[PDB]
């Protein structure tokens, strides 16, 4: 678990596309989602997800 909660040198998850953002709430949602994906796209748990 300790290792699975660690970052790595990669971007393991490549998610699909989403339509353009027009709703002032859609922009906030995109900002939050981008922050999360950036903070989590490297975790070895994501590597296990993919594998």
């Amino acid at each position: 678990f300790n290792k699975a909660c660690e970052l790595t040198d990669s971007s393991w998850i490549e998610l699909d596309e989403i339509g353009e953002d027009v709703a002032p709430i859609e922009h906030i949602a995109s900002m939050r989602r981008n922050y999360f994906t950036a903070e989590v796209s490297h975790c070895r748990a994501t590597e296990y997800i993919m594998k």
Binding site: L15, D16, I18, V22, E26, A29, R33
Partner: protein
């Protein structure tokens, strides 16, 4: 740093991070006759001090604990009292004036207008014709066929109650001859037929009717009560909790000490004696037509004589020859026990007397379901014996019940008062028949509690992917779910967008719909590649085809085809929305946008609306006739036809009429017309006998 995620609760309240306490986001991959024997034995151990009678009809030993000795310990017990249940129901009626009388009439309209097809809507049911599980519709068909062969055809009226008259008439027949298609006919003795009729499974088609009327009466009652949240879902149960809590914790004075008793009832389906349900339906249906008391009081009568079937059996294996048999449950009664282990030895020895031709005699209990809603009424009866009028003292209680889920509040003036109130509620429940679970219930001052996975703390706090029906019926179901959860279950914006992204990834990986520009190689790749070159505007392409996405949050409700309409090519519109497709298929208004998942989704019936691949003598006889009639009368698939002629007469009349208007229009080449008319004459002749 040894990471310990649970320590996160040291800063965030548990209710505000309870998500992390639910491990599985879907259905776990993991999952016998031993369990059935255990459930049969434990029920009889909870009623040891009960009368041991011998049903003279089914020939089974039955156990009657009602009006038995009062419990002498906290252990679970089912020695419920008729006086107490009747008094509880009477006090319930007084609090809610004219509830039973008003609800019986709303059930009168349903016990008469209901057809015999309501016994098909459901799940797998035991089939007394073959002693084998088998779908609901086919089980009903088999039962009807056997009844017709035996001469019980009053079910031809199309009324459910007439079918019930037929099953009760059968219950008196001396022999029921079953014809199986080799063509072997077997005759059942009256006794042999009875046990096969009063049999649960690990419940027959002869009990779906009465238990439907009892359940609808219970639902009608529960809708009126505001202390019952069973005949509701989601937003409804999220309002009753708030109302009750805000009612009780707004004490007019600081004297009142509120306390909530979040908890459950143990063995809730092994102590609810059917005889007790008969003794509260004979009260609910008071001063009602005597034919309305003999139809709602049959299932309780039948459930108290039920002969549960053990199941498959145990397998015997030798470590030398590595053999494996099954030991069918029938022979367990007459067998040498040296083979079995110790625990199985004790279980089979205990249950041996109760066996009758391989069938249990679980009289003193009620299996899961089967008045899941009447038991809710019983439970709310005792949540009503706390209204400060039937207590006569300072402490009073309220709450909700959802069939073994209650959130009882015990307002009182001091801690001793709260303890006395909890004790009295527990004792009353034990008298009525409800055994509270002391290993899962915790009492804490009001403000935070839990009710069937609804975690209330000063405020409230598996359906993502391809459903797998069509290609356009999934890009609608998934997007509809992503907004249903975003409106109801508080799913937020960013989570919604993430779910949409992952849903589209699953969509494109399951239907091989990856965009044309990307270079993932699959069977459908080449075709999509070509389709990605012809088109001038590529935004219009459906995600099902090689095409982009446009669903963010502001159009999660718009169906896809109407979303990409201005962006679509005319040469593409023509092919996509071509009513002469060989793929589009829908033969009923039922499934013209309705997936079992039953969900109401939006679709535009494009070429992506295709359908995936997959006792009577001819199981399709009814299907053949109905398909032919639909052919003759196209509106047979939309509106239930109404008429007085027989099917053959109507079909031949329309066949004659259509031909005449056709030959008069020159589209039938007279020689064909004469042949059609002579064929109609032949069919009409065949109808004379």
């Amino acid at each position: 740093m040894d990471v310990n995620p649970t320590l996160l609760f040291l800063k965030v309240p548990v209710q505000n991070a309870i998500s992390t306490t639910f491990p599985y986001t879907g259905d776990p991959p993991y999952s016998g006759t031993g369990y059935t024997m255990d459930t049969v034995n434990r029920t009889h151990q909870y009623s040891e001090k009960g009368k041991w009678t011998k049903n003279t009809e089914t020939g089974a030993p039955q156990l009657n604990p009602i009006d038995g000795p009062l419990p002498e310990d906290n252990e679970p017990s089912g020695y419920a009292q008729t006086d107490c249940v009747l008094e509880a129901m009477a006090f319930l009626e007084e609090s809610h004036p004219g509830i039973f009388e008003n609800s019986c009439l709303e059930t009168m309209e349903i016990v008469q207008q209901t057809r015999v097809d309501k016994l098909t809507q459901g799940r797998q049911t035991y089939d007394w014709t073959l002693n084998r599980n088998q779908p609901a519709a086919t089980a009903l068909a088999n039962t009807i066929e056997i009844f017709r062969s035996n001469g019980l055809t009053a079910n031809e009226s199309g009324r459910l109650i007439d079918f019930l008259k037929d099953v009760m008439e059968s219950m008196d027949k001396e022999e029921m001859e079953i014809t199986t298609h080799g063509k072997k006919k077997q005759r059942l003795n009256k006794k042999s037929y009875l046990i096969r009729a009063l049999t649960l499974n690990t419940p027959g088609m002869q009990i779906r009717g009465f238990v439907y009327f009892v359940e609808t009466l219970a639902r009608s009652i529960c809708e009126k009560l505001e202390q019952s949240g069973l005949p509701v879902g989601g937003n409804e149960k999220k309002a009753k909790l708030a109302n009750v809590v805000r009612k009780m914790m707004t004490n007019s004075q600081d004297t009142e000490l509120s306390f909530t008793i979040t908890g459950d009832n143990t063995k809730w389906n092994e102590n609810q004696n059917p005889r007790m349900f008969l003794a509260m339906i004979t009260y609910i249906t008071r001063n009602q037509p005597e034919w309305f008391r003999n139809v709602l009081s049959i299932a309780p009568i039948m459930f108290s004589n039920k002969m549960a079937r053990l199941g498959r059996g145990y397998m015997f294996e030798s470590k030398s020859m590595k053999l494996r048999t099954q030991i069918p449950a029938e022979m367990l009664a007459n067998i040498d026990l040296k083979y079995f282990n110790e625990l199985t030895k004790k279980k089979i020895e205990k249950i041996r007397p109760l066996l009758i031709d391989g069938t249990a005699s679980l009289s003193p209990g009620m299996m899961m379901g089967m008045f899941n809603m009447l038991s809710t009424v019983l439970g709310v009866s005792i949540l009503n014996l706390g209204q400060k009028r039937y207590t006569k003292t300072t402490y009073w209680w309220d709450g909700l019940q959802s069939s073994d889920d209650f959130a009882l509040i015990v307002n009182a003036p001091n801690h001793e008062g709260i303890q006395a109130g909890v004790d009295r509620f527990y004792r009353t429940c034990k008298l009525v028949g409800i055994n509270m679970s002391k290993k899962k219930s915790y009492i804490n001052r009001t403000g935070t509690f839990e009710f069937t996975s609804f975690f209330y703390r000063y405020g409230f706090v598996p359906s993502f992917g391809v459903s797998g029906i069509n290609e356009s019926a999934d890009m609608s179901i998934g997007v509809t779910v992503i907004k249903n959860n975003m409106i109801n279950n508080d799913l937020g914006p960013a989570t919604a967008q993430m779910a949409l992204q992952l849903f589209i990834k699953d969509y494109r990986y399951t239907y091989r719909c990856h965009r044309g520009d990307t270079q993932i190689q699959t069977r459908r790749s080449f075709e999509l590649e070509k389709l990605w070159e012809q088109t001038r505007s590529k935004a219009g392409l459906l995600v099902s085809d090689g095409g982009p996405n446009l669903y963010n949050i502001r159009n999660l409700h718009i169906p896809e085809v109407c979303l990409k309409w201005e962006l679509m090519d005319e040469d593409y519109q023509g092919r996509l929305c071509n009513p002469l497709n060989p793929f589009v298929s829908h033969k009923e208004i039922e499934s013209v946008n309705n997936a079992v998942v039953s969900m109401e989704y939006d679709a535009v019936a494009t070429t992506h609306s295709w359908i995936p691949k997959r006792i009577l003598e001819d199981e399709q006889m009814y299907q053949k006739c109905c398909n032919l009639f639909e052919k003759f009368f196209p509106s047979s698939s939309y509106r239930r036809p109404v008429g007085i002629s027989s099917m053959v007469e109507a079909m031949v009349s329309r066949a004659r009429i259509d031909a005449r208007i056709d030959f008069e229009s020159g589209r039938i080449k007279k020689e064909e017309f004469a042949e059609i008319m002579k064929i109609c004459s032949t069919i009409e002749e065949l109808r004379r006998p």
